[PDB]
Amino acid sequence: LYSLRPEHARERLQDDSVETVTSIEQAKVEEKIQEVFSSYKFNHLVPRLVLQREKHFHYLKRGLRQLTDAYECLDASRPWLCYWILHSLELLDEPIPQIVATDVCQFLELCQSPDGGFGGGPGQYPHLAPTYAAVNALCIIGTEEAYNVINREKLLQYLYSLKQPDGSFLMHVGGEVDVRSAYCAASVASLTNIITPDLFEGTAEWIARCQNWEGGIGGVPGMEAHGGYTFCGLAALVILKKERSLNLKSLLQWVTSRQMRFEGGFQGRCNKLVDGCYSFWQAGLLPLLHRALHAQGDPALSMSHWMFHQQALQEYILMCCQCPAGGLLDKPGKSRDFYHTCYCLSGLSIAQHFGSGAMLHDVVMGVPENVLQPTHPVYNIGPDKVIQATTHFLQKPVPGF
Amino acid sequence: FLSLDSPTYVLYRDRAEWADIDPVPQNDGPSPVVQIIYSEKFRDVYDYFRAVLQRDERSERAFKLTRDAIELNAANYTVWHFRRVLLRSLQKDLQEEMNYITAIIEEQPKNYQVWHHRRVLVEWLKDPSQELEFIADILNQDAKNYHAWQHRQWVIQEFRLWDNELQYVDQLLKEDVRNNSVWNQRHFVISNTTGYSDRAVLEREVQYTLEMIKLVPHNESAWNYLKGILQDRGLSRYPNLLNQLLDLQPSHSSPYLIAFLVDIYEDMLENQCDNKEDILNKALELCEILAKEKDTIRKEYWRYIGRSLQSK
Ligand SMILES: Cn1cncc1C[C@H](NCc1ccc(C#N)cc1)C(=O)N1CCC(C#N)=C(c2cccc3ccccc23)C1
Ligand SMILES: CC(C)CCC[C@@H](C)CCCC(C)C[C@@H](O)P(=O)(O)O
Ligand SMILES: [Zn+2]
């Protein structure tokens, strides 16, 4: 394993003897991770990376039905719980019962607002985060019924209701503004085919203002480059077919710098710590950046791998981010939840599967049963569900008015 | 009026001043999914919220209840919305509300609704007078709260409060020179006040940054900053650069020195230079060292820079 090797131990943190609150914390994670790595040596077994797929399936399978009061804090993010669960199952190639899928469809219908969009639960004001989630969920199911839950004529109204003169959108009426709104709108509008000619007017330009001196993208112009926001920005531009509104060179140097030499996983910001959910928000930016670069006819691009260590990211996740009882997590010690479960898995899948036209170099770490179904680097739903959804809505006219 | 934590806290259903109203329960449908098992307390406050809201009862008791609903789930943006409506309608003392949101943010500094709510109040009041001091207190508990820095940039931008922020940045950079949020803030500030075109400023900056590098050579932020402030004019338009950096090869080396040199070389090539053939050889060797020995986590990127360095 790349990680359990002896030279990899030189990838340890160089403190410069000038220790700050950052060195300290980084060094702390490194030791907890080293332990995991050396887990094998100390116990005298041969290393066998395996994805506790059944344990994870039973966790997910239960949460799709009910959660403890510990989830009272995500009581306004219910369509998200459907999406995270229904996507983890989707990647674990697990089943979505023709009855459960319906309930999900029926529940989301209760979340949907008469003004268009979706709320965090029955009766909540529509918000773009839950809307993005609900739409992705409905597409993962992908049936006349699910698709039919989505009110396209109302969704455009809503999208237009949040639209800002400078190109940005609010997340909800009277709500905040940051790149998530741009990606959320772009993802749902494109999939459901409601993109009019002036819907995203000036949106690519605002998103490009979020790109700062680091090569990365921030929440709003002027802010620090952040992985979750950079994924929102890049993916939003890919949708709008305007990746080029950015300096892709520096964005590439920035994202690639986010992978932790010693841990293998990614960090959300320069000088922060590794975190399993970033296995998708940050690593997902390379496939996006492959297309982009190859699109402008780039020759130096690989035909088998992404511009990040696919091996190291799979070791990090498999070894360090898996919960014995099921579910995945931030890093060792952290508690398990459906968000990290959905994103550690999405990242594993990104790391295991490459593409480049007709090239297909999958890399599956450990037990070959560890390979996951594929996921689309823009929507983060199975590439087949994406294709199936867009075309189905494509036979509907854009709500012209 | 009555704490959710008070030992003598009573359910709304058990309340005398809340008997005219009928608690509207959540409708998750005959066959629930991702259904939360709320506590009797959580369900009680919210069944009452659904009702007051559903009635659009814009009352003082409704106001005091959003408070409990917010404490049970501060991330409930719908309740936060109805509360702002009550703030306008009931014509509430906003400064008094500034104090409320101040305490709530201290409790959940990573919540999106609380920061936004605070921004709305400051706008309503057109008063940024407490902001930099409040933010600094939050950044004192977590020097990298994204929401805190973002809110901060808004207060500075909107109210044009730029004068003492660079002094602040310097303070925090003294506390943790690896604080990328501060390096970013320093850029935000300078680039919006004087800019980096001013030779004296540019020099002062590169000097200071070459210092932090020749002090904590493996601290990436200083490197991405120095590169950031110069790369926007051409690293190759700075002859002395390659040298001073080359001087740090054995005294302050990290794969950052090597990567920066690979970046200079790239630009001395874009701009065409004598010895370019050797330059390209030196640069590709560095790309192989970084790729094979010096920084293998990104061997895919480093060999790709080797291959692009071929075509262009
Ligand atoms: C400490 N930590 C480590 N990883 C994440 C966090 C905290 C927090 N996540 C909130 C959260 C916790 C559990 C579940 C479940 N099940 C779901 C969400 C976090 O860091 N953020 C802050 C900013 C942010 C944003 N934007 C988050 C986010 C991103 C995408 C979708 C979301 C949907 C609902 C709530 C939060 C998010 C998460
Ligand atoms: C489509 C989406 C809603 C994407 C969200 C992506 C994110 C994970 C965004 C994270 C937001 C921020 C600012 C988080 C910070 O509090 P931190 O970096 O500490 O986690
Ligand atoms: Zn995380």
mmCIF file of N, CA and C in Angstrom, chain A residues 120-200:
data_model
loop_
_atom_site.group_PDB
_atom_site.id
_atom_site.type_symbol
_atom_site.label_atom_id
_atom_site.label_comp_id
_atom_site.label_asym_id
_atom_site.label_seq_id
_atom_site.Cartn_x
_atom_site.Cartn_y
_atom_site.Cartn_z
ATOM 1 N N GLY A 120 -37.175 22.271 3.581
ATOM 2 C CA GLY A 120 -36.407 21.281 4.320
ATOM 3 C C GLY A 120 -37.254 20.157 4.877
ATOM 4 N N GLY A 121 -38.573 20.318 4.783
ATOM 5 C CA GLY A 121 -39.488 19.319 5.278
ATOM 6 C C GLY A 121 -40.901 19.757 4.956
ATOM 7 N N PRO A 122 -41.925 18.944 5.247
ATOM 8 C CA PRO A 122 -43.255 19.437 4.899
ATOM 9 C C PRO A 122 -43.521 20.814 5.506
ATOM 10 N N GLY A 123 -44.021 21.714 4.674
ATOM 11 C CA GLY A 123 -44.337 23.062 5.113
ATOM 12 C C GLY A 123 -43.251 24.115 5.239
ATOM 13 N N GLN A 124 -42.011 23.801 4.892
ATOM 14 C CA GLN A 124 -40.942 24.771 5.010
ATOM 15 C C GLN A 124 -40.758 25.555 3.731
ATOM 16 N N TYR A 125 -40.369 26.809 3.870
ATOM 17 C CA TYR A 125 -40.153 27.684 2.731
ATOM 18 C C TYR A 125 -39.128 27.043 1.838
ATOM 19 N N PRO A 126 -39.302 27.162 0.510
ATOM 20 C CA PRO A 126 -38.351 26.568 -0.440
ATOM 21 C C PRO A 126 -36.988 27.172 -0.245
ATOM 22 N N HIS A 127 -35.943 26.399 -0.471
ATOM 23 C CA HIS A 127 -34.580 26.868 -0.302
ATOM 24 C C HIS A 127 -33.829 26.105 -1.413
ATOM 25 N N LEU A 128 -32.805 26.715 -2.004
ATOM 26 C CA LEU A 128 -32.068 26.069 -3.080
ATOM 27 C C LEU A 128 -31.274 24.821 -2.665
ATOM 28 N N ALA A 129 -30.794 24.740 -1.419
ATOM 29 C CA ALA A 129 -30.042 23.557 -1.014
ATOM 30 C C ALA A 129 -30.986 22.326 -1.049
ATOM 31 N N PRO A 130 -32.165 22.375 -0.365
ATOM 32 C CA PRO A 130 -33.130 21.256 -0.340
ATOM 33 C C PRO A 130 -33.693 20.954 -1.739
ATOM 34 N N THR A 131 -33.816 21.993 -2.561
ATOM 35 C CA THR A 131 -34.293 21.882 -3.933
ATOM 36 C C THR A 131 -33.289 21.072 -4.736
ATOM 37 N N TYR A 132 -32.022 21.457 -4.644
ATOM 38 C CA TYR A 132 -30.983 20.718 -5.336
ATOM 39 C C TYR A 132 -31.031 19.245 -4.929
ATOM 40 N N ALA A 133 -31.166 19.011 -3.631
ATOM 41 C CA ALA A 133 -31.215 17.671 -3.085
ATOM 42 C C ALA A 133 -32.437 16.897 -3.554
ATOM 43 N N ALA A 134 -33.611 17.506 -3.465
ATOM 44 C CA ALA A 134 -34.856 16.845 -3.846
ATOM 45 C C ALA A 134 -34.775 16.414 -5.299
ATOM 46 N N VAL A 135 -34.352 17.331 -6.163
ATOM 47 C CA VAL A 135 -34.229 17.021 -7.587
ATOM 48 C C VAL A 135 -33.250 15.859 -7.827
ATOM 49 N N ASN A 136 -32.100 15.874 -7.159
ATOM 50 C CA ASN A 136 -31.154 14.792 -7.325
ATOM 51 C C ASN A 136 -31.773 13.479 -6.860
ATOM 52 N N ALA A 137 -32.517 13.514 -5.759
ATOM 53 C CA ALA A 137 -33.138 12.324 -5.225
ATOM 54 C C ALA A 137 -34.088 11.803 -6.293
ATOM 55 N N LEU A 138 -35.064 12.625 -6.668
ATOM 56 C CA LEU A 138 -36.051 12.240 -7.676
ATOM 57 C C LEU A 138 -35.433 11.646 -8.936
ATOM 58 N N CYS A 139 -34.253 12.117 -9.311
ATOM 59 C CA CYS A 139 -33.589 11.595 -10.494
ATOM 60 C C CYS A 139 -32.906 10.255 -10.213
ATOM 61 N N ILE A 140 -32.360 10.083 -9.010
ATOM 62 C CA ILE A 140 -31.727 8.820 -8.659
ATOM 63 C C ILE A 140 -32.811 7.741 -8.791
ATOM 64 N N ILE A 141 -34.030 8.044 -8.339
ATOM 65 C CA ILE A 141 -35.114 7.092 -8.460
ATOM 66 C C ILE A 141 -35.305 7.001 -9.980
ATOM 67 N N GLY A 142 -35.688 8.119 -10.575
ATOM 68 C CA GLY A 142 -35.827 8.178 -12.023
ATOM 69 C C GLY A 142 -36.958 7.423 -12.698
ATOM 70 N N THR A 143 -38.188 7.793 -12.369
ATOM 71 C CA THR A 143 -39.389 7.144 -12.907
ATOM 72 C C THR A 143 -40.387 8.224 -13.284
ATOM 73 N N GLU A 144 -41.323 7.908 -14.166
ATOM 74 C CA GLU A 144 -42.319 8.889 -14.565
ATOM 75 C C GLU A 144 -42.869 9.567 -13.318
ATOM 76 N N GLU A 145 -43.086 8.782 -12.262
ATOM 77 C CA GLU A 145 -43.633 9.309 -11.020
ATOM 78 C C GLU A 145 -42.713 10.331 -10.370
ATOM 79 N N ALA A 146 -41.475 9.925 -10.121
ATOM 80 C CA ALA A 146 -40.521 10.799 -9.469
ATOM 81 C C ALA A 146 -40.369 12.085 -10.268
ATOM 82 N N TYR A 147 -40.018 11.943 -11.539
ATOM 83 C CA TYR A 147 -39.850 13.109 -12.403
ATOM 84 C C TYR A 147 -41.081 14.005 -12.357
ATOM 85 N N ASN A 148 -42.241 13.384 -12.324
ATOM 86 C CA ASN A 148 -43.488 14.117 -12.340
ATOM 87 C C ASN A 148 -43.792 14.876 -11.055
ATOM 88 N N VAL A 149 -43.010 14.656 -10.000
ATOM 89 C CA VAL A 149 -43.244 15.351 -8.735
ATOM 90 C C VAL A 149 -42.805 16.801 -8.920
ATOM 91 N N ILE A 150 -41.724 16.971 -9.686
ATOM 92 C CA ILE A 150 -41.121 18.281 -9.952
ATOM 93 C C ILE A 150 -41.957 19.228 -10.807
ATOM 94 N N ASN A 151 -42.388 20.336 -10.207
ATOM 95 C CA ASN A 151 -43.185 21.348 -10.924
ATOM 96 C C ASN A 151 -42.258 22.340 -11.616
ATOM 97 N N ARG A 152 -41.994 22.086 -12.899
ATOM 98 C CA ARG A 152 -41.070 22.875 -13.731
ATOM 99 C C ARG A 152 -41.458 24.307 -14.023
ATOM 100 N N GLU A 153 -42.752 24.561 -14.111
ATOM 101 C CA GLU A 153 -43.222 25.907 -14.410
ATOM 102 C C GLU A 153 -43.081 26.770 -13.152
ATOM 103 N N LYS A 154 -43.159 26.121 -11.996
ATOM 104 C CA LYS A 154 -43.060 26.809 -10.719
ATOM 105 C C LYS A 154 -41.603 26.940 -10.323
ATOM 106 N N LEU A 155 -40.802 25.967 -10.742
ATOM 107 C CA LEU A 155 -39.378 25.956 -10.411
ATOM 108 C C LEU A 155 -38.681 27.148 -11.077
ATOM 109 N N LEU A 156 -39.091 27.479 -12.291
ATOM 110 C CA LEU A 156 -38.497 28.618 -12.984
ATOM 111 C C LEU A 156 -38.893 29.903 -12.245
ATOM 112 N N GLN A 157 -40.164 30.010 -11.869
ATOM 113 C CA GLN A 157 -40.642 31.187 -11.147
ATOM 114 C C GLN A 157 -39.737 31.397 -9.960
ATOM 115 N N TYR A 158 -39.597 30.333 -9.178
ATOM 116 C CA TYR A 158 -38.801 30.346 -7.977
ATOM 117 C C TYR A 158 -37.371 30.753 -8.282
ATOM 118 N N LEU A 159 -36.752 30.083 -9.250
ATOM 119 C CA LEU A 159 -35.361 30.395 -9.610
ATOM 120 C C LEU A 159 -35.232 31.877 -9.935
ATOM 121 N N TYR A 160 -36.173 32.382 -10.703
ATOM 122 C CA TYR A 160 -36.152 33.781 -11.061
ATOM 123 C C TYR A 160 -36.374 34.646 -9.824
ATOM 124 N N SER A 161 -37.109 34.149 -8.836
ATOM 125 C CA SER A 161 -37.393 34.933 -7.647
ATOM 126 C C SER A 161 -36.142 35.216 -6.821
ATOM 127 N N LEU A 162 -35.135 34.344 -6.944
ATOM 128 C CA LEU A 162 -33.902 34.492 -6.175
ATOM 129 C C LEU A 162 -32.795 35.225 -6.915
ATOM 130 N N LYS A 163 -32.907 35.246 -8.233
ATOM 131 C CA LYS A 163 -31.922 35.881 -9.111
ATOM 132 C C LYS A 163 -31.588 37.328 -8.742
ATOM 133 N N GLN A 164 -30.292 37.619 -8.695
ATOM 134 C CA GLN A 164 -29.751 38.935 -8.338
ATOM 135 C C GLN A 164 -29.199 39.688 -9.519
ATOM 136 N N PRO A 165 -29.296 41.018 -9.480
ATOM 137 C CA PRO A 165 -28.788 41.822 -10.579
ATOM 138 C C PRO A 165 -27.336 41.566 -10.912
ATOM 139 N N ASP A 166 -26.512 41.262 -9.926
ATOM 140 C CA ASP A 166 -25.096 41.010 -10.224
ATOM 141 C C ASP A 166 -24.794 39.599 -10.726
ATOM 142 N N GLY A 167 -25.831 38.798 -10.939
ATOM 143 C CA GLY A 167 -25.605 37.453 -11.433
ATOM 144 C C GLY A 167 -25.725 36.326 -10.436
ATOM 145 N N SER A 168 -25.681 36.655 -9.150
ATOM 146 C CA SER A 168 -25.801 35.667 -8.102
ATOM 147 C C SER A 168 -27.287 35.447 -7.804
ATOM 148 N N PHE A 169 -27.591 34.409 -7.030
ATOM 149 C CA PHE A 169 -28.956 34.081 -6.609
ATOM 150 C C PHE A 169 -28.945 34.041 -5.076
ATOM 151 N N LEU A 170 -30.104 34.171 -4.457
ATOM 152 C CA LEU A 170 -30.190 34.062 -3.005
ATOM 153 C C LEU A 170 -30.421 32.570 -2.815
ATOM 154 N N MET A 171 -30.228 32.053 -1.608
ATOM 155 C CA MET A 171 -30.459 30.631 -1.382
ATOM 156 C C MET A 171 -31.953 30.445 -1.183
ATOM 157 N N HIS A 172 -32.574 31.476 -0.624
ATOM 158 C CA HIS A 172 -34.009 31.498 -0.406
ATOM 159 C C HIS A 172 -34.456 32.949 -0.275
ATOM 160 N N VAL A 173 -35.757 33.189 -0.314
ATOM 161 C CA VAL A 173 -36.268 34.548 -0.195
ATOM 162 C C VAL A 173 -35.854 35.096 1.158
ATOM 163 N N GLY A 174 -35.169 36.225 1.109
ATOM 164 C CA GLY A 174 -34.708 36.844 2.330
ATOM 165 C C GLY A 174 -33.495 36.120 2.879
ATOM 166 N N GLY A 175 -32.945 35.205 2.076
ATOM 167 C CA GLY A 175 -31.793 34.435 2.509
ATOM 168 C C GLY A 175 -30.452 34.937 1.989
ATOM 169 N N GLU A 176 -29.364 34.277 2.400
ATOM 170 C CA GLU A 176 -28.003 34.643 2.012
ATOM 171 C C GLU A 176 -27.608 34.327 0.556
ATOM 172 N N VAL A 177 -26.486 34.910 0.146
ATOM 173 C CA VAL A 177 -25.920 34.696 -1.181
ATOM 174 C C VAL A 177 -24.456 34.190 -1.115
ATOM 175 N N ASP A 178 -24.140 33.160 -1.900
ATOM 176 C CA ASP A 178 -22.788 32.572 -1.975
ATOM 177 C C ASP A 178 -22.863 31.576 -3.145
ATOM 178 N N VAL A 179 -21.743 31.080 -3.650
ATOM 179 C CA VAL A 179 -21.772 30.168 -4.809
ATOM 180 C C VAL A 179 -22.692 28.974 -4.806
ATOM 181 N N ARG A 180 -23.053 28.452 -3.641
ATOM 182 C CA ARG A 180 -23.909 27.280 -3.602
ATOM 183 C C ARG A 180 -25.176 27.557 -4.400
ATOM 184 N N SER A 181 -25.688 28.781 -4.306
ATOM 185 C CA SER A 181 -26.933 29.121 -4.994
ATOM 186 C C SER A 181 -26.799 28.991 -6.518
ATOM 187 N N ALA A 182 -25.629 29.342 -7.024
ATOM 188 C CA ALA A 182 -25.368 29.288 -8.447
ATOM 189 C C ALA A 182 -25.357 27.862 -8.965
ATOM 190 N N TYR A 183 -24.709 26.961 -8.223
ATOM 191 C CA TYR A 183 -24.604 25.555 -8.601
ATOM 192 C C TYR A 183 -25.961 24.889 -8.418
ATOM 193 N N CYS A 184 -26.627 25.209 -7.312
ATOM 194 C CA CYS A 184 -27.913 24.610 -7.034
ATOM 195 C C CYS A 184 -28.883 24.937 -8.154
ATOM 196 N N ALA A 185 -28.976 26.215 -8.503
ATOM 197 C CA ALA A 185 -29.872 26.623 -9.570
ATOM 198 C C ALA A 185 -29.489 25.968 -10.894
ATOM 199 N N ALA A 186 -28.226 26.091 -11.279
ATOM 200 C CA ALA A 186 -27.749 25.497 -12.511
ATOM 201 C C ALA A 186 -28.020 23.980 -12.614
ATOM 202 N N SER A 187 -27.784 23.238 -11.533
ATOM 203 C CA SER A 187 -27.980 21.794 -11.529
ATOM 204 C C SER A 187 -29.450 21.406 -11.744
ATOM 205 N N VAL A 188 -30.360 22.023 -10.989
ATOM 206 C CA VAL A 188 -31.790 21.699 -11.118
ATOM 207 C C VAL A 188 -32.436 22.221 -12.399
ATOM 208 N N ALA A 189 -32.042 23.411 -12.823
ATOM 209 C CA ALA A 189 -32.599 24.027 -14.024
ATOM 210 C C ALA A 189 -32.179 23.277 -15.262
ATOM 211 N N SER A 190 -30.916 22.878 -15.328
ATOM 212 C CA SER A 190 -30.431 22.133 -16.491
ATOM 213 C C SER A 190 -31.073 20.735 -16.581
ATOM 214 N N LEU A 191 -31.025 19.966 -15.496
ATOM 215 C CA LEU A 191 -31.595 18.633 -15.463
ATOM 216 C C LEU A 191 -33.062 18.666 -15.878
ATOM 217 N N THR A 192 -33.837 19.584 -15.307
ATOM 218 C CA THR A 192 -35.267 19.669 -15.637
ATOM 219 C C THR A 192 -35.555 20.492 -16.898
ATOM 220 N N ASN A 193 -34.508 20.962 -17.556
ATOM 221 C CA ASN A 193 -34.691 21.728 -18.783
ATOM 222 C C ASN A 193 -35.631 22.926 -18.640
ATOM 223 N N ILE A 194 -35.228 23.920 -17.862
ATOM 224 C CA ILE A 194 -36.047 25.113 -17.673
ATOM 225 C C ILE A 194 -35.155 26.300 -17.907
ATOM 226 N N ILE A 195 -33.946 26.066 -18.409
ATOM 227 C CA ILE A 195 -33.020 27.171 -18.659
ATOM 228 C C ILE A 195 -33.421 28.030 -19.848
ATOM 229 N N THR A 196 -33.863 29.237 -19.539
ATOM 230 C CA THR A 196 -34.275 30.208 -20.543
ATOM 231 C C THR A 196 -32.997 30.900 -20.973
ATOM 232 N N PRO A 197 -33.069 31.847 -21.920
ATOM 233 C CA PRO A 197 -31.864 32.556 -22.380
ATOM 234 C C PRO A 197 -31.268 33.550 -21.362
ATOM 235 N N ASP A 198 -32.095 34.176 -20.533
ATOM 236 C CA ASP A 198 -31.592 35.138 -19.562
ATOM 237 C C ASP A 198 -31.600 34.651 -18.111
ATOM 238 N N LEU A 199 -31.933 33.386 -17.892
ATOM 239 C CA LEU A 199 -31.962 32.878 -16.529
ATOM 240 C C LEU A 199 -30.638 33.131 -15.782
ATOM 241 N N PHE A 200 -29.542 32.629 -16.338
ATOM 242 C CA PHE A 200 -28.228 32.764 -15.714
ATOM 243 C C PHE A 200 -27.399 33.914 -16.248
#
